[model samples]
Target: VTDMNPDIEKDQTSDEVTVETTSVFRADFLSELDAPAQAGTESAVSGVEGLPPGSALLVVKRGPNAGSRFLLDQAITSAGRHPDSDIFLDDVTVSRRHAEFRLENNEFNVVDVGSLNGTYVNREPVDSAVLANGDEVQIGKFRLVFLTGPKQGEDDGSTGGP
Candidate 1:
């Protein structure tokens, strides 16, 4: 058998070698293209909406600055008619030293500073009250909403207002 057709055996071996590059290798080659498709897995761990932890926002519900959001980025954020206040409302009902917002123990607390119109939460007057997410705040004629992050669903009209 060795001496019969040596060239014929060589040709057969070459043909067999070519055909051996089969689906096994082709499947591996095709799977390699999917490596790039996995890049979307790192789509970001946190989709931050707004202020980070320990910070909060005072969204104007009704006032001259209605539909606006003021960042309470400090430990002590004051809202008053005074120009020195962190949040100033140019209204007569608001006292010069109207309300104070204190960030203590990771809780936002509001205290009235003896304003004539007084500070209120959810339609009830409050000398000092801890605010929760979406809690409505009334300071003089202005109405505000306490928020931790971006407003959940309701439209505060911050985007469409002129």
Candidate 2:
């Protein structure tokens, strides 16, 4: 009856989780399923691709910045045509104040504050939608791929950056 291994404490208290097996302490539970591999468990991923872990990338797919990339590492990332925005676009279809992305508790969400053509998630329009890894976000004449994982070398004969 020996407490076998990993001790996860909650709320800065002594509440501990224990694991025990018959004549052996197996980690089969941690390594299973349908169980879901760790994506947003330990911590949410952020920033652009190829930079660091926990980085989400907004990759331009179609527009003036197509093939370009913008990094999201902080809590709030503003996207629009305005100069004050953290992420800017040069497309005429983009609003002067188009939309915004907020990272809360390790979850990334995009909110359309009020735009002309509207903000779309995977082709579906939403006032505010929680972004999934590798989601297609179309704004104005531009299309960006919101990614939480590494860049998959999205090639379309366009070289973009800055």
Candidate 3:
């Protein structure tokens, strides 16, 4: 709460609110911004950000890190408990090099590199699985949704659509 927090986060279009209440922490200290908020212009502590040109989002829907988002800006992304992984899961159940997803031809392909707990897509286990937009993915005890946009729903994962 000590940081400068915004009331809402809007998309580049400026028409839709992507985040209900995302905190906008300035690199600077909050002491300067605090006085402004106390002066009755809390609304001044807000902003809008556009999405990256082309990227996919891994939305954690369940487990300890639920509500977390990992933005994939590359053609390949690795997820696991290992420090080298692009998406790191802090849980003990997740193993190093647990899984990987690739964005090819605007489509997403997921593969399990073998793990103690295993990876599941839509409740089925597989060494590799093709993903439809909004498809549910499970790794270890984590529930996640592979999305392409900041907004949720039908239009979210356009390029990677089913």
| Candidate with best lDDT | 1
- Candidate 3, residues 7-53, lDDT tens digits: the string is 54533564555434222222112212223221111113322122335
* Candidate 1 local lDDT, 70-109, one digit each (tens): 4567877777555665776653446654467877776667
At residue 46, give the lDDT of candidate 2: 28
Please identify which of the two predictions, 2 or 3, would achieve the higher TM-score against the true structure.
2
| List of clashing residue pairs for candidate 1 | none
Question: Candidate 1, 142: how far from true, in Å?
Answer: 0.9
Q: What's the true lDDT of residue 66 in model 3?
A: 54
Q: Point out where model 3 deviates above 4 Å.
A: 1-52, 149-162
Off by over 4 Å in 2: 1-52, 150-162
Backbone clash count, each prediction separately? 0, 5, 0
Model 2 residue pairs with clashes: 46-54, 46-55, 46-56, 47-55, 47-56
List CA RMSD, all candidates.
Answer: 29.0, 21.5, 19.8
On a 0 to 1 TM-score scale, where does candidate 3 land against the true structure? Answer: 0.53
Q: lDDT per prediction?
A: 0.55, 0.54, 0.53
For candidate 3, list the clashing residue pairs, or say none. Answer: none
Model 1 residue runs over 4 Å out of place are 1-50, 68-70, 149-162
